[PDB]
Amino acid sequence: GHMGNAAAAKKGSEQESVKEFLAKAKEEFLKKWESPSQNTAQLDHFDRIKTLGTGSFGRVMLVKHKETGNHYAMKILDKQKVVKLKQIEHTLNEKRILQAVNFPFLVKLEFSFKDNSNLYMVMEYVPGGEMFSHLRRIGRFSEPHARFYAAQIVLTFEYLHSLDLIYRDLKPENLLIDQQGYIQVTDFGFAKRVKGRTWTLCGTPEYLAPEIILSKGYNKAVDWWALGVLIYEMAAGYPPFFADQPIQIYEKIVSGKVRFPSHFSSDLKDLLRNLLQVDLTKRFGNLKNGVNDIKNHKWFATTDWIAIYQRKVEAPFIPKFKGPGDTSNFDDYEEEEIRVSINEKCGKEFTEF
C-alpha cells in the first residue's frame, strides 16, 4: 500500500487525537454559546486612533486602551442602519459566535458593549493587513507559501465544522496576516449552525460553490469548494473562474471545467480538481474520509499539521511592523466622527447584544 506499518500507525493515532481534541473543543464552545458574555467595557476606555476599514458593515477603528496601552481593532455598527438593512440576526449571531469560539487562527473578541447609537466589538489588532493586499502586491504566492496559508484554513474549517458551523465568507479580502505571519479569520456574518442542509444565497461570486448558484439545499462542503478557489487564487494570482459580470462567472463555475497555469504542479492540480468538484458525491471534504482526504493528499505531504497549529513553523513572510499601533498595512480613510445620541435607538432589537 502507500504506507508502511510505522507511517500508517502514526497517521491513525494522529487522526484519533484530532477527534479527541475536537470533542473537547465542541463541549467548551457549547457552554459559552449558552452563557454569552456581555457589556464588558465602555467607549471612554479607549482613544480613537485611525479608521482601518469602512463599508456597509459599519467601520473598524484602531483604538488604544487607556489603562493598559494595548491596541485593538474596534468594529462599530450603527444600530439604526443595521435595522434598516435587515441585519439584526446576522449581527447578533456574529457576536455570539466570536465570544464562543477559541482557535489560534480565529480573531479574539476582547470586549463588547453598546450605547444609544452603536454596537461595539473590540477585537485583537491584527497589524499585517489583508492577504488580498499582499497577494496583489507580490502577484502570486509560491506553492510552499500558499500551502502554509492553506494548511491554516484546513485546520480552521476542521474546527468550525466540528462545531457544526458553516463559514461561507472565505476570500483573500477576509483573511488577515498577524505579526508572526499567520492567518486570522475575522468575519462571521455569514456563519451559521448547520448540521444538515441550509439554503441562503450568500457569498462572493468568484467563491460560490455550484450548488449555491443552482439554488440547492447545500451543506458544509461549500467551504471546501471555497478552499479550492482560495488555493488556486493564491498560487496563480487570479481565481479559477472570472468574467466581466457575475452571470458569466456562474456559467463557468457550474460547467465542471477548470483550467490551470502551466506552472502549477501536478500535485496541486490533482488537489484542486478534487476540491473544485461540481459533483458532491466526489468532492474532497464531503466523502466518508472527511477532512482526511485533504490532509493526506500529496500536495500536503510536507505539512506538519501539529506544528502549524502550535505556530512553530517559520512563516514564509513577516509583514512590516515598525512597532505597536503601526497601520502601514491598511488603507487610508476619511475619519467620520463617532456621534452618540441623547436618545436610545433600537433597544428592543438589540437587547441580547
Binding site: 488580498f132 496583489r136 465568507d169 476570500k171 479580502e173 455569514f190 444565497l201 450568500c202 457569498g203 462572493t204 461570486p205 468568484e206 460560490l208 494570482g237 487570479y238 472570472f242 468574467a243 466581466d244 457575475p246 483550467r259 497555469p261
Partner: peptide, 18 residues
C-alpha cells in the same frame, strides 16, 4: 494571456458579497 483577461475583466480589486 489568462492574466491579461483577468485585468480586462476589471474584477481585480476588492470584491463585494452578493
Amino acid at each position: 494571456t489568462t492574466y491579461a483577461d483577468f485585468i480586462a475583466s476589471g474584477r481585480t480589486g476588492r470584491r463585494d458579497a452578493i
